[PDB]
């Protein structure tokens, strides 16, 4: 029930450390079971393929992320740039696995969007309608800008220098 | 110029190809065997299958740069208006932009030098739907901000994350917001 339960953390790590070791593409399922120590059928059973398992990890490493709304939330994103660029290996695996899931293959896809809310609410600080579509829209774009610095178009300093923008022009009217 | 015409097939196929299949199931010797020439042509023109496709994206937003040129209200609006006509055009084909998208967020710019260029030829069409012949950095920076945010609202569209006419909503607020100083 419980044993259940950090059999289900046991699998995660197994995943994110892997994906540090070695690229998304030679990660292999029976290395991430064997490395959790479970059978390797329990680990498809909870997680189909790499794709799923990998935006679990996504979902599960948002989760884990001044005053003024505008500068917390963008504090908020300048903290997470810097975890994940640190991690290029990692983080490729998260967002790709992302942005390349079909919400209905892959259903916790569908709970990203939904994910990153809650902490922008959280770093934000009860709102309407043009908060959740600022919010919605910058993390959007963030995801853009991290992919665009995984892939030397937008080095660190020039990837902050445009969540710095996007988040002062996306958020003007942000109560 | 023959490299035109053989270039032309290349590309032609690559679009057929994409269209019948998912991304992972397009090999570069059946569109090899598609535009009627050797395995060993199509590599020297396209040293890889995501170098293929960046060149088909390129094709391909020169494409409809000429179509918006062609029967097409504030310099905002007209970047909304082409962006409402890219989204459309694409989604149109889901199956061939989604190969076309995932080979441009995973295109190393430094290993693949047409990637940049869709960026630029972007950002042209745009520019000029608006009219602005004179860029600031300001304008150059929404304007990256702009596509950047729209590739993610595309991406998340084919994923079924968002509707179609919130993905549509979506840009217009992102215009709104992000070119407030599009002189």
Redesign the interface.
């Known amino acids: 029930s419980e044993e259940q339960r950090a059999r289900h953390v046991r699998m995660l790590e197994a995943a994110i450390e892997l994906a540090t070791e070695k690229e998304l593409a030679r990660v292999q399922m029976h290395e991430v079971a064997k490395r959790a120590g479970v059978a390797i059928g329990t680990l498809y059973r909870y997680f189909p393929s790499k794709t799923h398992l990998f935006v679990a990890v996504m979902v599960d490493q948002i989760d884990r992320m001044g005053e003024s709304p505008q500068d917390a939330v963008y504090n908020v994103l300048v903290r997470a740039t810097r975890g994940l660029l640190r991690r290029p290996a990692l983080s490729t695996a998260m967002i ?1 696995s992302t ?6 293959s892959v259903p916790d ?2 709970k990203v ?1 939904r994910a990153f809310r809650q902490i922008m609410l959280d770093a934000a600080g009860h709102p309407t309608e043009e908060d959740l ?2 919010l ?2 910058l993390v ?2 963030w ?3 991290i ?2 610095c995984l ?3 937008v080095s660190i300093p020039d990837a902050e220098s ?1 969540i710095r ?2 988040c002062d ?2 958020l ?1 009217n942000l109560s």
């Open positions: 790709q942005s390349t899931a079909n919400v209905a896809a569908g969007d579509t600022a919605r829209l959007q774009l995801f853009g800008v992919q665009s892939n030397g178009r445009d923008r996007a022009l996306l003007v």
